[PDB]
Design a protein around this ligand. Sequence first.
Ligand SMILES: Nc1nc2c(ncn2[C@@H]2O[C@H](COP(=O)(O)OP(=O)(O)O)[C@@H](O)[C@H]2O)c(=O)[nH]1
Ligand SMILES: [Mg+2]
Length: 856
Amino acid sequence: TVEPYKVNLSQDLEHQLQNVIQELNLEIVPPPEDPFLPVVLNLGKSQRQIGVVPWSPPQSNWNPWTSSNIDEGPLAYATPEQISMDLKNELMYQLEQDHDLQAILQERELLPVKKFESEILEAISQNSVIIIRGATGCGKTTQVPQFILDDFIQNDRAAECNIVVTQPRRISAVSVAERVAYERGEEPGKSCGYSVRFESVLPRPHASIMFCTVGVLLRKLEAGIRGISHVIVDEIHERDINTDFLLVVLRDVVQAYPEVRIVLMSATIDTSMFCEYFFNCPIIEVYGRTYPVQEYFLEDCIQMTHFVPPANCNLICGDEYGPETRMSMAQLNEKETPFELIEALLKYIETLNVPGAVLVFLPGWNLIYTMQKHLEMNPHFGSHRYQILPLHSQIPREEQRKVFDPVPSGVTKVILSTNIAETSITINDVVYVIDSCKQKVKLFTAHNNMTNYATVWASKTNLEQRKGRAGRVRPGFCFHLCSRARFERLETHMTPEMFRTPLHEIALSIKLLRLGGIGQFLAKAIEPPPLDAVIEAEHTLRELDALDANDELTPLGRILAKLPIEPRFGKMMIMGCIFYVGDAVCTISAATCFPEPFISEGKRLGYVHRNFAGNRFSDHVALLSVFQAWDDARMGGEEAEIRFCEHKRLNMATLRMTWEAKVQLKEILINSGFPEDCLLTQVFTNTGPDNNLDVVISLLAFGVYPNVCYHKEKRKILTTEGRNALIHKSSVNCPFSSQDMKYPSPFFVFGEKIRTRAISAKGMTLVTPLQLLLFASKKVQSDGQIVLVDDWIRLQISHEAAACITALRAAMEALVVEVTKQPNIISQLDPVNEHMLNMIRQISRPSAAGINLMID
Ligand SMILES: Nc1nc2c(ncn2[C@@H]2O[C@H](COP(=O)(O)OP(=O)(O)O)[C@@H](O)[C@H]2O)c(=O)[nH]1
Ligand SMILES: [Mg+2]
């Protein structure tokens, strides 16, 4: 129930728009005769239709990690025998001389998996595929790759060994590589290395192990699996979607190329499904010292602590529990975690007088931080008695290492962890587990473009796994914070990611690797995705013109497939290159893969952070401005950079990683034939007239579509669906206090539409109505005076302007198509296209929509 917004467009500009449309002979939909018969302004707009990824074994003059020949140095002509012997002698000498390494090796030899060394190696040698199955903490991840390598080293065949190990997490690929390297008396870069999105330390070319994320490996596979003897797929039980996807690829590989070795490694689950998939391959069981764990539930926890709090399975409770327990539990909301009970449980654990670390499973960083703050508010849980350590993805690896370290006696180590500590890493000296019984999952619904970082129930399997983390040292205890009635209503297994994740990126991968049809290939998965997700992916890619009508990969699609970024941002980056603002658009795109550099602590931004925004009412401009300032401060060396980040309360690691990501995105564009000149760093002002920045904001609107909203008053905004929503507290556009903001336009585009208790728009950038029509709208209807954008908002603007702007969008799309066929035309672009681009440049300006940002 909102009146149409009145767009102040001058006669001069309206005529200029018409002239450009006329000069380029672009089709325009004429005005309607009857005002109750509205006309759609939206203008309309090949190759020939199961491949297998090739494999080849290691050879001496090939570097499989850089995917290039070894020409220079002695390794170009050296025989395998020479290489093998030199490495064997090097290693033998190291073991003789290094006492600290001897001690480290002695620890290795006591790991449960050590017993099974000969059996594993035997199995792998005799079979194209095996499964290694055993409890978490046995040493599958860290030892099995070493066992394989050392077997080849010690039998004079070091040169014939190159191992890829996939991990479902970035943090695991890096951390395992550093752990294994340490276990071999090295830094990463010698026998071990890693490769994640936008960061790698490559190992030596021979007798080497590479730990990587699945996405990294897949992007490399368009040239085949070249010079690799073993592919180890780790933690298959997590049902990471990219892992599931890779298993499909590998099954075809191993059938056509049975000399390759595949090793799938799994926790204690039913692996029948995987076994049958890979031609009833062997299962090698691994086990060690298991202690019994006494498990408790919310009833038990409340009773032994005497805790009293300030569909619903907390209303159900057995008769064998007392009336106050029933009463207490019946007050607890299941959607929350009882923080005060966890506090109470920690105190109860002290009275047992058996020392040991406590591991607390919490869904995400929010509840870890909430729990951590809660404890440090009580002096009881101070340095003298307690060492409370967070464990999640985004803490520095320095802090992550501290969870393994021992504490001075009398101090209790408490680890507030995500599910990383469920099956991927094992914290030693754990005797007590407190389990939220929750998981954190990212749900996305395409229809409304809604993101939900949802707190959901864990599975019975998860609870069993979490319970087992208390029983590696001595008889332990596990405090589940769900009712005994709730437990019964838990699913046995989590929904695999394949069932609940968008597939457009996997779809591009399928096409880049020439594996055939998208639906056809995914139908062969171990558990295929639902039909609707496939249709949504196909639709998404057709809309982008990544696929043609025949669903074959266009030049545009090929580029998007090579960019490790959301395809739509990939397209935004291409458009950025065309407008010669490639660097800024690569920066926006890179930043989506990392947390916010602003250390805001979940509060409203302060003065310093807000100032980066200038007068643009834009979180994206703020981001770009911190990168400009940060890069300037780096001129004066590391300490100047450190002090800048500390003074401005910025995460320096985030900035550095984002920068490196940007560099690589540029690299891929360069190699795709885009000119260097369209990707240069360009100084900008965030206060004064800046047409480069105007255009970036226009392209951002395209990037984040369909996320556009309309400001009503205060924090309340209207979404594409017509629903009410809030400006996120972290935005520069969120009012610091009670003083209202005077936006010169009510329209904003934003990065994420998030569902919690309300609908939130996060990462918000003001745009003009002209930018809305140009890049933030698919469907536009006009009655001659009023225009209806995607059936949610109305503009009072001339028919002709709206129609011309719609044609600009169409013309821009056509140019993008041409540019992807031949990217070098960017630098030598004909006048007719420059005319079209210049018109977009003009309507990107605030002044085009009657706005002057320098005047309040
Ligand atoms: N101190 C320490 N121990 C580690 C580290 N990474 C792994 N471990 C230990 O190595 C052993 C085997 O772990 P891992 O290979 O992950 O076992 P998996 O669960 O079978 O994959 C366990 O005792 C772990 O605690 C680390 O970074 N530091
Ligand atoms: Mg493991």
